[PDB]
Design a protein around this ligand. Structure first.
Ligand code: NA
Lengths: 361, 379
């Protein structure tokens, strides 16, 4: 019975978003299409995350529910001419798609085969929530035995919203005032796949997003989309104890010059370890790398530093990841000795903080 | 009265090669030369030669040899050396824009210096680098780079890849009269392009350039108003532009007598919109069989109906208006073969010349017969 008409572009926007989360059970590879009143809902799931896109239908629509191959329907919609009206109907377990001189018949699976209260509720600018994820996501573990590290901590304390990610070798954290009435500290761990998907969804430059923090789920709503993710059932480590406090050396350098020098020198680093050596002295940072072929790279970078000497080793990729998220022209490194972590911040604020464990030289 | 030497020695003299060059001036030949570089350590290296004010860079995979040239503006010490190609390229590319690069051999190392950056790379003597011993040239001619690039780009998609019939894994370049023609086929579909080049030859000459080499050659022919010198040997092809010298081994075989497979008896002409047809074929292909990619064409007066079906009984259909007055004709094709041909058609209209359901389609651009595409039907 299900039948509706929709412009290519109106259908394409939520379809593309929904198909993006779709990846043994045949129904899992399908998009759930629901027509109720003058509203079309599009749902996609991989069992960990669920994405619901909603469209308001302008013309007359007969209600119903059906599942159809998500990738095929998205590809069909994408391939159709711009601004064409698409007519969609269900006829004998098949989805019939008509647009201009084109006709498509898709196989379907029943909607019946298709798969709690919020502890805290708040609204945030999409730009702000995306910033928390994008400034820290590179530091999340991937398939680590410590399962609670294969995702991102989202923490509310006072009126601050904080993101924390770590793989046990390096850490990234970002804090922003959001003015959330919490009274008691709440923590949630979003799985790495779900949090990276959420960041990609927050595109509204001046838009808002309603956040609901549940016991075993997180819900993000923007009016057009409903994103639901399961939570990692564990306690995030006491990261406050991992933050270096010793720091006696303040180095201020050019973000770009440092990133380029670390990257260039790494060309001649050992392919299996990717280690670089830093030799810090008054106003100067010497960057060196060597490989088993006795090839050597050396670069001297002028830095703002007045202190004693320090020789320290690092995995170049950890340094490159941190520098890739620094938004200011200058970067601050806070160091102590050869066996202690580097603490990194942007030039003018402490809202973002990065920790990198050194490598033995 | 006898004197020392019999190839100078068992060990070459040390190199004192030294030059300075702007980052961008070096990067241009270096990226192209390093691009052809893939157990033999010397093969991973670029050969650097300084003679007078000329720097030459050579890369090889033993199939193709690419030489890039750059005129040195500053004083240079002559010499030759080999150094890891990718490492040198990656270093050069990574250096700040417009920087002056100092390159010198110091003992057995290549010292690269730019500003406060220093790199020490391993080397192998130039004496260890492979040499091309190309036999005499059967024919030499010059042609516009744009014309030779056109012949390759209009036909390269049709070459076989890893076919046991090794002579199909490349492109025929044929001189017949004054004409230069390219032909490529995989045994299922064929592409050809012909240009009146006015070459100083009367006899038919044929060479088969391996697929990897011909694709490389096309990417190098960038000078829009530039000329290219061609040498056809019995076992090699050489292309020279002033900035580069490209040499490729030829496929040691005989190209099929392709003339015998070009359809001649086509009585049904279809004139259609290239883009509209390509977009309709692509849309309907979504519901075609993932392996066979078969699409059914139902032709009737002024109309083409396209139909695709897959094993799950899904179906896609599209009607496209065409200029056609042949009879009712049902013909099947691999959609990827049709998409490949329409992708190289430069005119807004395309011509299909057909006969029956079991005979090859002949495809041309709207206004000329310079390019010709043959697609065998399915069933
Ligand atoms: Na057109």
């Amino acid at each position: 019975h299900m039948h509706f008409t929709i412009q290519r572009e109106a259908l394409l926007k939520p379809l593309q978003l929904v198909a993006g989360v779709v990846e043994t059970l045949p129904v899992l590879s399908n998009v759930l299409l629901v027509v109720e009143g003058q509203q079309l809902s599009l749902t996609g799931t991989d069992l960990e995350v669920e994405l619901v896109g909603r469209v308001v239908l302008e013309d007359a629509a007969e209600p119903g529910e059906i599942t159809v191959p998500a990738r095929k329907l998205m590809d069909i919609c994408k391939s159709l001419p711009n601004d064409v009206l698409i007519d969609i109907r269900v006829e004998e377990q098949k989805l019939l798609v008509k647009a201009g001189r084109s006709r498509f018949t898709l196989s379907t699976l029943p909607a019946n085969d298709f798969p709690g209260p919020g502890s805290l509720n708040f609204s945030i600018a999409q730009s702000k929530l995306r910033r928390l994820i994008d400034r820290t996501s590179f530091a999340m573990a991937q398939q680590d035995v410590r399962y609670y590290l294969n995702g991102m901590l989202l923490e509310v304390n006072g009126g601050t919203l904080r993101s924390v990610a770590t793989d046990g070798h390096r850490l990234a954290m970002c804090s922003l005032d959001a003015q959330i009435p919490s009274q008691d500290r709440h923590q949630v761990i979003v799985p790495r796949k779900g949090i990276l998907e959420l960041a990609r969804l927050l595109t509204e430059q001046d838009g808002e997003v309603g956040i609901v923090l549940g016991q075993h789920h997180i819900r993000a709503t923007t009016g057009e989309f409903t994103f639901t993710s399961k939570l990692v059932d564990g306690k995030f480590p006491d990261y406050e104890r991992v933050l270096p406090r010793g720091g006696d050396k303040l180095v201020v350098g050019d973000r770009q010059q440092l990133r380029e020098a670390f990257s260039r020198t790494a060309i001649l680093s050992n392919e299996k370890y990717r280690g670089i050596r830093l030799q810090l002295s008054n106003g100067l940072l010497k960057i060196q790398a060597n490989n088993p072929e006795q090839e050597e790279a050396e670069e001297e970078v002028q830095v703002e530093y007045n202190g004693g000497n320090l020789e320290i080793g690092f995995n170049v990729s950890y340094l490159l990841d941190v520098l890739g998220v620094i938004g200011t022209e200058q970067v601050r490194f806070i160091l102590s000795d050869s066996n202690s972590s580097a603490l990194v911040h942007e030039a003018d604020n402490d809202d973002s903080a990065y920790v990198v464990m050194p490598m033995r030289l």
